[PDB]
């Protein structure tokens, strides 16, 4: 499957300020309300069937990293799959380009 | 495991529908009964089933 | 309804989500009412619905 590559941020030192959990739950509740309508967007990717191309809405004017996630056909992701060779393509390298 | 009580009369239970986005708002607002997939039906005051 | 050699794209909405816990149990299926299809029409699945 294709997914957007959500990179880690910098590992800044883990302070234990409990207040952070409140602002995380505030943002999660606002996100749960927005998940009713933002369903068309690239952040709302639903796991596709084989060959089931999805339309996703995305803003112009940026670069974006993607990840090729590999599974067995029980559907489990591999703990390592670094023996494979990948092939990255686009229908138009003016509109969107690796 | 595999045995129950022979009979249970305890009909008064606190049944709810829960809304999956209700994370923050500790507010007594009359939320619009339009966005839910389901509704809990009223108990009829007909003869005891 | 089509002319000889004409081709159409067809689109669909509603029905079950890939079952929450397992999802590989889901399917979409598309077939015609003849045991002999490959001489009369060609059916090809698209992207999404």
Automatic annotation (TrEMBL), chain A:
<comment type="similarity">
    <text>Belongs to the NUP210 family.</text>
</comment>
<feature type="region of interest" description="Disordered">
    <location>
        <begin position="10"/>
        <end position="29"/>
    </location>
</feature>
<feature type="compositionally biased region" description="Low complexity">
    <location>
        <begin position="19"/>
        <end position="29"/>
    </location>
</feature>
<protein>
    <submittedName>
        <fullName>Nucleoporin 210</fullName>
    </submittedName>
</protein>
TrEMBL record, chain B:
<comment type="similarity">
    <text>Belongs to the NUP210 family.</text>
</comment>
<protein>
    <submittedName>
        <fullName>Nucleoporin 210</fullName>
    </submittedName>
</protein>
